[PDB]
Design a protein around this nucleic acid. Structure first.
Lengths: 78, 136, 386
RNA sequence: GUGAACAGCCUCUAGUUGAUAGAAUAAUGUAGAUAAGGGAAGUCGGCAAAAUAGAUCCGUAACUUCGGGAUAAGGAUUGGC
RNA sequence: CUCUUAAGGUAGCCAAAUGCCUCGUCAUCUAAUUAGUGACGCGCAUGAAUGGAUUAACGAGAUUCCCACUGUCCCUAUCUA
RNA sequence: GCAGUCAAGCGUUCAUAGCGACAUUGCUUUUUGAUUCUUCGAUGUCGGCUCUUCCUAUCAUACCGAAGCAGAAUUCGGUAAGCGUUGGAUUGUUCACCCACUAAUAGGGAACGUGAGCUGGGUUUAGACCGUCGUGAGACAGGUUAGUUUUACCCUACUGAUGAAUGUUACCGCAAUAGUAAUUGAACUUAGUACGAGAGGAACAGUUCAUUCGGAUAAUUGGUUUUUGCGGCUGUCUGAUCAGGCAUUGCCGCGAAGCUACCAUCCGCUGGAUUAUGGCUGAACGCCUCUAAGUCAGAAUCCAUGCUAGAACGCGGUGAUUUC
């Protein structure tokens, strides 16, 4: 079993759960719940919904994962 | 389905009863198809014979070339727009009811198909599987 | 006349009278057939239905398109604590039926079973089996002779058992009690097995085993006095229908100038005793263990118990049974299991089952997570936490 | 007050707080509503219900008793600061 | 050519709310139409202020089709007082 | 309307594979009539909607037989009513004619079933129009349009729900009786094999699915929402803010729980006795014959297994059985 991701909220989907939608351009979306599906039908944007992973990312909430890339200072020595 | 069947079909929820209209997917010179009958339907009082995906139906053309209008012809359903379940557990649905034209033994009148189809149809109607760009 | 467009009937005439059961515990109207060669085992069991959940496995049904491929299935869960054995009775055959002649009980009984012989426990001396218990303590005289009588007669035997209700979350305290037939051999050996298991406990593993097909019996759910359209399935009359439309219009003709038993009328729906067969088992589970809901693929130490417990039942700290499909009975209800009567090969009953994943997500909502730790790791820490 | 408006909704002055009550929430009803996918296949019959709806801007056919048709049709916008 | 009338239905219109036979024949509309519309006319039994033919606008009039719309229906379900 | 008897002829030849003239015997009461027994101090009078049941004169399905049956398809017939017998255009229609699916789209009865069950399109009041007839009022199974559908709270029946008395009370049970349900199809393989010159073209077993029906359930999907749960929006009122009131549940979005849907999922048993028919032995009739005696196999049949209720006057086992 593969565990899929919500196209809208970024949440996780376990099997037998949520829905799957297929748009006229032959694209796929996966929804965990009728909530997300209904807002998608209402053609909202997730970047302005406050309980989404995209929102929290773009606003840098829970962003303690990535810190920095250090700087190297060392000669060839060869 | 029926004579052109490359096998069997697990059930899928009915969305397309008669009097229905579904867009045409192929390049046969049609726009919409008006369903009137379903091969394989049963018989219960005051129930409308309904179609689903993969099914073969009889249909007319309310818009398109007069070379095709005003006669009845076999058609296939490839998109349903109603949620149906797969045995892998997921429910799914397209956005539009869509079908194509065919002969009784499966061959298509057109050559190409626009937009996606259902695997439940591409696994049953092989000529559709060839002219399909997408299968899901 | 000659009803214009023929059609079938609305309803089965074999599940009549559609009335209430006389006892919430349904009665096994048939036990399997005996083979007097096998060892001594039970043909049945009791358990309290908890609720459904969701299950994914991999199929072995050649010929199908879903072969060696994952599919989901919906199961139901039964809390089957270790049942207790108190007594056996003996039926002998007559031209007018199997007839009991003796019921023999054990000495010490629990105050969750001898509540079943009272309707008002809080004001009583509890005064039950106190003289039957003094019938013991002189070695076996009035008891072993009854057993010998049973061995001397009694082509058929049935064992009395009672649930250990208290181990469940329920607020009943009043053990359910039941007769269960044995289908070992040597009726003497049967009653000896019993006499040994008196005041003792029986688990479900000894009886049922995985991939076994069974029958489930229970009193279905109650909905009450309901009308014809939802009790049977008639047509709703059209809209412009004076004097109501969720009715049946013609309930008979002028002759026979009476109303027939076959006509759809209104009344009770639910609380009927029903039997549903060929319900495969997918798992037996031990409550003396965690990882009950764990497999060889998931390997996350979680129980079958979902998040927030089951709805209106609670937890499954006891042993349990996970069986395919939807069986009669609403949650918290007693459920009488039973082994099948016939052998069903079918290419669909001999299937060997190996699960892949189990759902512990909440049923009190659109549960996203299967586990609180998963939830914590996904969301991150919160205000409550530190 | 809103608002084109003695429309509808709210409120002040004045007046009533009268209409047999209580406890539960089964069917069938009366009144009101909502419903996936399809969309009159129902039906004597699109009955009933829904949809549309105000204002501003654009655009407006056949036909005509040249006065009308015409809010034709059919489209867009509409808040708060 | 003939018989006959006071004169012999002219112009116009039609299976029309008037046409028996009759679901008239042809075409179109529909997948399919005793319906509808347009044409034909030996018209049981059209027809000229018993008003004829037509006619824009209007019609809580009768009628058919199309678009939108929808629980009318497939097929029922649920809630409220 | 249906079925028979005979058999002239058709059928290449051939009366009877299938048909069947001239004649003739019958059934039925789903046509229409004849009659006028009942009803005029009223039996609610067409068709459709719904719903059940019954019949068989079987459309299909199961098993069989015959063939002008090579295969396929098809026709005649037998046991059998167990099971199912549609969606639609037009018409007020029944009847009908077409489109299409279908395994099949058989016929009919029950006060020409069914109006305190619906509708009220038609006929069949009163209004009005036309045509023809009539001097005229007016007539016309000639046409058109509009036109109030009442009451059940009684008895029974039915469906469900209790319930006195059986020494009491509680538990566990038996099962007389009654009811009964499962149905049908396609694909793959069998096999492009059998069969046949070729054209063409099967079946049994097996497997996977599906149709119709039913019974449960509600993990998931969907619907519903007075959780008036959360949030938002308008107008107004509380001086403003916060928090809220009213708008016949104010409106919108989401929405748990519960209820629910082939709009979701699961499940839907196997043994015996037989029919038609084919047979064994075997006489009658020294032979032959499925029958006379006896007997074998055999259907969607029948009875059981199983499933549902449990006789409130059918029953059993068991526990405890009041002291002032």
């Amino acid at each position: 079993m593969k565990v899929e991701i919500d196209s809208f909220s970024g949440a996780k989907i376990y099997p037998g759960r949520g829905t799957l939608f297929v748009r006229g351009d032959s694209k796929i979306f996966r929804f965990q719940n009728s909530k997300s599906a209904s807002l998608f039908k209402q053609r909202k944007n997730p970047r302005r919904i406050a309980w989404t992973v995209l929102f929290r990312k773009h606003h840098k909430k829970g962003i303690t994962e990535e810190v920095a890339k250090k700087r190297s200072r060392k000669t060839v020595k060869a | 389905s029926g004579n052109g069947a490359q096998g069997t079909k697990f059930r899928i929820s009915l969305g397309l009863p008669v009097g229905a209209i579904m867009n045409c997917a192929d390049n046969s010179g049609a726009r919409n198809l008006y369903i009137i009958a379903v091969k394989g339907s049963g018989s219960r009082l005051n129930r409308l014979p309904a179609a689903s995906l993969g099914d073969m139906v009889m249909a007319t053309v309310k818009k398109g070339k007069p070379e095709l209008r005003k006669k009845v012809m076999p058609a296939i359903v490839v998109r349903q727009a109603k949620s149906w379940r797969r045995r892998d557990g997921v429910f799914l649905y397209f956005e539009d009811n869509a079908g194509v034209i065919a002969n009784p033994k499966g061959e298509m009148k057109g050559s190409a198909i626009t937009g996606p189809v259902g695997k439940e149809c591409a696994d049953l109607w092989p000529r559709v599987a060839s002219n399909s760009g997408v299968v899901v | 006349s000659h009803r214009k467009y023929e059609a079938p009937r609305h309803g089965h005439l074999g599940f009549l009278p559609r009335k209430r059961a006389a006892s919430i515990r349904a009665r096994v109207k048939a036990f399997p057939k005996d083979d007097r060669s096998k060892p001594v085992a039970l043909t049945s069991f009791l358990g309290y239905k908890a609720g459904m959940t969701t299950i994914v496995r991999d199929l072995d049904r050649p010929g199908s398109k879903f072969h060696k491929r994952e599919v989901v299935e919906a199961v139901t869960v039964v809390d089957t604590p270790p049942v207790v054995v108190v007594g056996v009775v003996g039926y002998v055959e007559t031209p007018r039926g199997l007839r009991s002649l003796t019921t023999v009980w054990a000495e010490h009984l629990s105050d969750e079973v001898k509540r079943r012989f009272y309707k008002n426990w809080y004001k009583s001396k509890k005064k039950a089996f106190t003289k039957y218990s003094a019938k013991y303590a002189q070695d076996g005289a009035g008891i072993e002779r009854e057993l010998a009588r049973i061995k001397k007669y009694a082509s058929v035997v049935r064992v009395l058992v009672h649930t250990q209700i208290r181990k469940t979350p329920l607020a009943q305290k009043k053990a359910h009690l039941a007769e269960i037939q044995l289908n070992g051999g040597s009726i003497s050996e049967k009653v000896d097995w019993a006499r040994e298991h008196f005041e003792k406990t029986v688990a479900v593993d000894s009886v049922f085993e995985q991939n076994e097909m069974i029958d489930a019996i229970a009193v279905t759910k109650g909905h009450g006095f309901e009308g014809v359209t939802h009790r049977w399935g008639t047509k709703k009359l059209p809209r412009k229908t004076h004097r109501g439309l969720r009715k049946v219009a013609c309930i008979g003709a002028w002759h026979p100038a009476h109303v027939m038993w076959s006509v759809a009328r209104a009344g009770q729906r639910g609380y009927h005793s029903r039997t549903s067969i060929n319900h495969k088992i997918y798992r037996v589970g031990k409550g003396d263990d965690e990882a009950n809901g764990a497999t060889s693929f998931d390997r996350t130490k979680k129980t079958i118990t979902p998040m927030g417990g089951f709805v209106h039942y609670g937890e499954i700290k006891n042993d349990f049974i996970m069986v395919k499909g939807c069986i009669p009975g609403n949650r918290k209800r007693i459920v009488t299991l039973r082994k099948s009567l016939y052998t069903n090969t079918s290419r669909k009953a001999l299937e060997e089952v190996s699960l892949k994943w189990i759902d512990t997500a909440s049923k009190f909502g659109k549960g996203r997570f299967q586990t609180p730790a998963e939830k914590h790791a996904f969301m991150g820490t919160l205000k409550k936490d530190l």
